[PDB]
């Protein structure tokens, strides 16, 4: 015959629950959400107020610096400690020029000494913070050959006119060679030579050491492979010439597999402010005291009125110091509670029968 097959799914009789937002089961839901979110917001603010950080900008360590021990202007340094809220303790900073190099735009060395009135447990991250450096433009972020990153010795035929991801304006130089780390990304590396230790000043016997091994996800070591070039068809990018004045030879080829500083720079920042990890410490707690940091000044900043600096922190389980998560949980909980009270009042004042059959539009 032609009778349709009867079934719980074919006859639109699937097992289901029909919910109606009756006040018998709306106020409990709002109270549950409000209580849970206030609890979580309070917990996150309690855990997050404990984090401490030190931000020290040093873009003015060349022009506006003295050869003597000055004090950082109150417009650069920012110390945030959860145990000393009245702790200004302006840090000192000195400039040591270097007339050997002809790069007059920015050169020398910056000696920044600060004081930590507490200690950071078993994990200290030193990041370089940049500001007003546009690293998310369309042409900038899409220009880096993937074949060279993967280690293949791709030629100009497949590095200049590849798909949408290709190093267009910095593919080859005037001598017919192709840059090894081609692209506007690798050509714009952060050249500030950060040190390998925070030299102490009150006790020189125990310097606080940092290692630049493991400052990137280990996973990228399965993607950044050693190159396969013969140092005869490649040249450093135009902005890298000061690092390899004689060009690429048999031994100066940079092995990007373990070059974590460069791996962290091949992920362009999403927004204008940039914070990329450059030094890590995972073994020894940093005891409270005065510490010194010596930083190179190869990378020019003031030409585009940008900013650069260091950001030292222990971090937390939700990143660095950021009240936003706790504030917005508190706002959500407060709004839910306020809405619960509003419904309670408007239900006790404009009350009505729940299954009011005499309120339908056709029964009036």
């Amino acid at each position: 015959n032609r009778r349709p097959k009867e079934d719980a799914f074919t006859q639109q009789r699937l097992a289901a629950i029909n919910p109606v937002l009756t006040p018998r089961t709306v106020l409990p839901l709002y109270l549950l959400i409000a209580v849970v979110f206030v609890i979580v917001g309070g917990c996150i603010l309690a855990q997050n107020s404990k984090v401490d950080e030190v931000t020290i900008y040093y873009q003015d360590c060349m022009t506006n610096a003295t050869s003597s021990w000055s004090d950082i202007p109150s417009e650069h340094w920012q110390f945030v400690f959860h145990k000393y809220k009245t702790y200004n303790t302006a840090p000192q900073w000195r400039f040591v020029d270097d007339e050997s190099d002809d790069f007059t735009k920015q050169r020398g060395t910056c000696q920044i000494r600060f004081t930590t009135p507490s200690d950071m447990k078993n994990n200290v991250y030193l990041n370089y913070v940049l500001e007003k450096f546009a690293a998310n433009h369309r042409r900038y972020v899409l220009s880096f050959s993937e074949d060279q990153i993967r280690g293949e010795d791709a030629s100009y035929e497949t590095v200049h006119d590849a798909t949408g991801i290709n190093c267009k304006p910095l593919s080859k130089n005037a001598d017919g060679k192709i840059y090894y780390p081609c692209g506007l990304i690798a050509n714009s590396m952060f050249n500030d030579t950060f040190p390998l230790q925070l030299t102490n000043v009150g006790d020189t016997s125990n310097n606080y050491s940092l290692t630049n091994k493991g400052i990137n996800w280990e996973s990228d070591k399965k993607r950044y492979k050693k190159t396969k070039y013969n140092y005869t068809q490649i040249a450093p990018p135009p902005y890298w010439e000061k690092m390899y004045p004689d060009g690429y030879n048999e031994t100066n080829i940079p092995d990007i597999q373990d070059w974590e500083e460069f791996q962290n720079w091949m992920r362009p920042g999403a927004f204008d402010k940039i914070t990329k990890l450059i030094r890590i410490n995972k073994n020894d707690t940093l005891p409270a005291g005065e510490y010194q940091l010596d930083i190179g000044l190869h990378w020019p900043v003031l030409e585009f009125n940008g900013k650069k600096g260091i950001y030292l922190t222990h971090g937390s389980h939700l990143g660095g110091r950021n009240p936003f998560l706790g504030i917005v949980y508190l706002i959500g909980g407060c709004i839910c509670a306020a809405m619960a009270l509003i419904l309670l009042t408007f239900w006790l004042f404009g009350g009505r029968k729940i299954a009011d059959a005499s309120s339908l539009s056709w029964n009036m």
């Binding site: 015959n1 032609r2 009778r3 097959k5 009867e6 074919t10 006859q11 639109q12 009789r13 699937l14 289901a16 029909n18 937002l21 009756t22 959400i33 979110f37 996150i44 994990n123 990041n127 450096f133 546009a134 998310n136 433009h137 369309r138 042409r139 900038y140 972020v141 899409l142 993937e146 993967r150 506007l184 990228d220 993607r223 962290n264 992920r267 362009p268 920042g269 999403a270 927004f271 204008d272 914070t275 990329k276 030409e303 585009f304 009125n305 922190t313 939700l318 990143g319 660095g320 998560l325 959500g332 709004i335 809405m339 239900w347 729940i354 299954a355 059959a357 309120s359 339908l360 056709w362």
Partner: protein, 910 residues
């Protein structure tokens, strides 16, 4: 690409599904608003891209930013063409607001709704084995906005099972009977119907027994059967032989001979007994006439090439048929000319309409009083619900008959539209005939039609009846069913009789004055230009229950003139009843087109028969009843059902469900696209709109396909407003589908505004979690990449959109919820699968890095809350404080009012 190629397979798979589901044209109403909404969405895209291009180019002439040192962008162009290329790249990234899948998703959902209609057990007529097959798949939501149901008395309201009950012969009413129509009329009068009905039934049984005994004692017939003797007049069996003289006897003999001879029925032997016959014909009334003539004594059998074999009280003779003119709907009469011996004369006998035969009646050889007696007898028959049939005879000499035959075989034998000359010849030969009486045939309604009409009228539908039998029988049938209830007065617009003397003029002025008067005292509504503007704008609702009755001439004059047309339109906007009688099929099509085109509304045109196909074709939702042999009304229709008692389910359950489902789908489909493209734009306010894409290149082609495209389809297909039982119990809900109170541009605009706000919340939570130090990775390694921010934003947007779809769904089944959880699972698992592959070079660790970060979940939960909080709060302070009828009904049947009736229930079932 991948946003346009995988749609080509689906758009042909959805048609292969229709083809498979058919071996076993015109658009809907929501499509126009859909096109308008798509246009407005393109307008929003254009304004966004215009702003993006305006900003991108302002900063190229600004202070020395950091793009002229590390990017080598030293080219002599900043706004002549760089703004142009910025706008072009902006639009090619923003193509997300170009809805291509909308015209595929809506097709899939309409096809699924039509299939669910086709596979409903309650839409199955077991007796005939005919499930409700939707001939057209696009029209499935048009059933939820029906305001006029143009019924048809031919075979929809009444089954075409004719039963002879009475007949008038020379002023004598041979026939006594008692059916449900008589009981209904008596109940309308007020007298008792139970005891009186039983007494009349037993008297009728006694009369039938006496009749059959007298017939058996009279003579013998080879086809007599005591089961088909529905005629219960013992006053004719006595008159047959001699018992009341010869003037009445010969007239009765001629009457029965006319019944037995004038026919178009084919004769075949019975399968079991070759002596028994199984005469079959396309016209049930002709079959009933032939059967009663045969069983009263004048048997008809066989079919010769010239003449018809007939048995008269025993003698088996062979007539001589000369010509026969068939019966057409526009002609309303069927005739035949035969030879009568003594130069033998020609006898022409015709049967036709009550009014047509009276118009086609001679004024020379008549009794001058038999006309009035026959007219009063026919009116009495029709008042109790008997569709009459007039018989007219004529005697001719061979000269005039031969001249008529010459005209007939010179004109009706020709080509190039022969039917006009055929009609001319027929009207020439049918201008002088004498009435010899009429008959009475009744047919009962279908099963549950009174309750079906009660449900249809209770749900605000203003149903019409384009009958053709006659005025009185139509009024009686409307009273027997629920089209004409009590406490209602009938404005008759009949342009003759008693309403002609008061306004004595041509029918033009008669109908003008009568319609204008009735419209004046019944309402303050006089006018024909601006009152139509209120009528169009107010969207319709019955009030002040009245009824209107229109004749064939009244209809043909009330829609011919412009002022007549609008006056008729304004008058017939009354509550629930417009009985148009004696109407031709052209008049049916004209009135349907009038109601549809002017004051654009929704017109269901249920019917059955080859004459009302013009009504079905020239309508919006043409439901075709599968009844008698005339299945031409089903093939050229929009739907097909076993019998009328199914429309009350096809309009009150599937129509309302489909309309609500699509009206809930469309705004959410624009919502899910806005909440993503505006997120791209909000990322675009940073980096000065240069053209970077926040998400991956593989979220363009998987956000509108797999992440959040399945839950919307399931919402629009498998959502039940209320279970069908309550929809039957409370048809008044369907009212919201009539006033257009569910799909209006305000709802869509508000949904788009909610999409914009939720895009703001969706994008600006990850940024606010990133703006201070941008090291939120619980170990400082740093995500920092626009693809991982895109993962944050996409996760928030997908979860919020799925939960938004799940909130506005009326029925939480185990299917839609399962697919919402599965869509979230698809997003997470596919991010994991694609990220752990060399083909995701830049991304390469989305799952391992982003998803393990407690910051990601800490921001996802709050994004989900803050996205749904405004809508949920507004719904709670609107479904408790300004509740619509649907919320009250849902609260009622959750309390347990409608907890007694089972799931498979419908009042339209005896």
């Amino acid at each position: 690409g991948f946003a346009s190629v995988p749609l080509i397979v689906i758009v042909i798979i959805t048609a292969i599904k229709d083809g498979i589901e058919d071996s076993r044209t015109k658009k809907s109403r929501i499509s126009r608003e859909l096109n308008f909404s798509v246009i407005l969405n393109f307008v929003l895209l254009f304004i966004l891209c215009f702003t993006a291009g305006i900003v991108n180019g302002v900063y190229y002439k600004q202070k020395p930013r950091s793009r002229d040192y590390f990017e080598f962008g030293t080219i002599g162009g900043s706004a002549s063409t760089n703004g142009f290329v910025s706008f072009w790249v902006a639009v090619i990234l923003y193509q997300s607001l170009v809805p291509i899948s909308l015209y595929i998703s809506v097709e899939i959902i309409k096809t699924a709704q039509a299939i669910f209609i086709y596979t409903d057990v309650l839409l199955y007529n077991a007796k005939l084995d005919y499930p409700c097959t939707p001939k057209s798949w696009n029209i499935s939501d048009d059933l939820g906005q029906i305001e006029y149901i143009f019924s048809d008395k031919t075979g929809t309201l009444t089954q075409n099972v004719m039963e002879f009950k009475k007949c008038t012969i020379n002023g004598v009413s041979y026939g006594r009977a008692y059916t449900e129509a008589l009981a209904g009329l008596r109940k309308r009068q007020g007298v008792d119907v139970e005891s009186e009905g039983r007494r009349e039934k037993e008297e009728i049984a006694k009369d039938r027994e006496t009749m059959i005994d007298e017939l058996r004692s009279m003579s013998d017939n080879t086809q007599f059967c005591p089961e088909d003797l529905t005629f219960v007049s013992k006053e004719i069996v006595e008159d047959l032989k001699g018992s009341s003289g010869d003037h009445q006897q010969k007239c009765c003999e001629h009457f029965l001979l006319a019944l037995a001879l004038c026919h178009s029925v084919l004769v075949e032997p019975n399968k079991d007994d070759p002596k028994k016959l199984d005469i079959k014909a396309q016209s049930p009334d002709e079959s009933a006439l032939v059967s009663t003539a045969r069983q009263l004594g004048y048997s008809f059998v066989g079919s010769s090439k010239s003449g018809l074999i007939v048995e008269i009280q025993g003698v088996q003779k062979e007539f001589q048929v000369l010509n026969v003119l068939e019966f057409n709907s526009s002609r309303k009469r069927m005739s035949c000319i035969i030879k009568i011996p003594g130069e033998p004369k020609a006898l022409l006998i015709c049967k036709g309409a009550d009014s047509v035969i009276y118009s086609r009646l001679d004024r020379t050889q008549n009794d001058a009083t038999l006309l009035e007696k026959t007219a009063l007898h026919l009116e009495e028959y029709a008042t109790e619900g008997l569709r009459t049939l007039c018989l007219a005879q004529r005697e001719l000499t061979w000269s005039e008959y031969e001249r008529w035959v010459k005209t007939y075989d010179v004109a009706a034998a020709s080509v190039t539209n022969r039917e006009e000359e055929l009609d001319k010849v027929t009207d020439v030969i049918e201008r002088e005939l004498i009435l010899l009486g009429g008959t009475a045939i009744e047919d009962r309604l279908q099963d549950g039609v009174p309750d079906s009409i009660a449900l249809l009228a209770e749900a605000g539908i203003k149903l019409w009846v384009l009958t053709g039998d006659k005025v009185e029988t139509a009024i009686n049938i409307g009273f027997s069913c629920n089209v004409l209830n009590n406490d209602m007065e009938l404005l008759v617009v009949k342009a003759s009789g008693e309403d002609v003397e008061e306004f004595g003029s041509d029918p033009i002025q008669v109908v003008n004055n009568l319609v204008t008067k009735y419209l004046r005292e019944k309402f303050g509504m006089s006018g024909s230009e601006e009152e139509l503007k209120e009528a169009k704008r107010e969207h319709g609702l019955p009030q002040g229950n009245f009824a209107v009755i229109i004749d064939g001439d009244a209809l043909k004059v009330a829609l011919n003139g412009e002022e007549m047309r609008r006056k008729f339109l304004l008058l017939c906007k009354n509550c629930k009843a417009v009985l148009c009688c004696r109407v031709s099929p052209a008049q049916k099509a004209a009135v349907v087109k009038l109601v549809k085109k002017t004051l654009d509304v929704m017109t269901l045109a249920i019917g059955d028969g080859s004459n009302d196909v013009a009504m079905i074709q020239s309508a919006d939702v043409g439901v075709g009843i599968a009844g008698e042999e005339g299945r031409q009304a089903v093939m050229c229709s929009d739907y097909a059902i076993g019998q009328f008692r199914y429309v009350t389910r096809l309009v009150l359950v599937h129509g309302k469900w489909c309309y609500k489902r699509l009206a809930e789908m469309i705004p959410q489909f624009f919502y899910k696209n806005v909440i993503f493209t505006l997120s791209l734009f909000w990322y675009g306010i940073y980096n000065n709109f240069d053209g970077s894409y926040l998400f991956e290149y593989t979220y363009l082609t998987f956000y509108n396909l797999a992440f959040t495209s399945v839950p919307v389809i399931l919402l629009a297909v498998l959502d039940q407003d209320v279970s069908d039982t309550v929809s039957m119990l409370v048809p008044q809900l369907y009212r919201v589908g009539i006033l257009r109170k569910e799909w209006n541009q305000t709802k869509f605009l508000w949904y788009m505004l909610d999409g914009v706000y939720q895009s703001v919340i969706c994008f600006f939570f990850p940024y606010l979690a990133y703006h201070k130090n941008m090291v939120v990775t619980e170990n400082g390694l740093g995500l920092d990449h626009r693809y991982f921010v895109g993962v944050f934003v996409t996760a928030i947007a997908v979860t919020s959109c799925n939960f938004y779809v799940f909130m506005e769904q009326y029925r939480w089944d185990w299917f839609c919820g399962l697919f919402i959880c599965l869509s979230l699972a698809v997003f997470y698992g596919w991010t994991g699968i694609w990220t752990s592959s060399s083909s995701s070079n830049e991304f390469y660790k989305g799952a391992a890095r982003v998803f393990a970060q407690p910051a990601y979940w800490a921001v996802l939960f709050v994004g989900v809350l803050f996205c749904l909080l405004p809508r949920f709060t507004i719904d709670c302070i609107r479904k408790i404080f300004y509740p619509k009828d649907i919320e009250i009904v849902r609260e009622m049947w959750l309390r347990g009012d409608f907890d007694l009736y089972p799931q498979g229930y419908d009042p339209t079932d005896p």
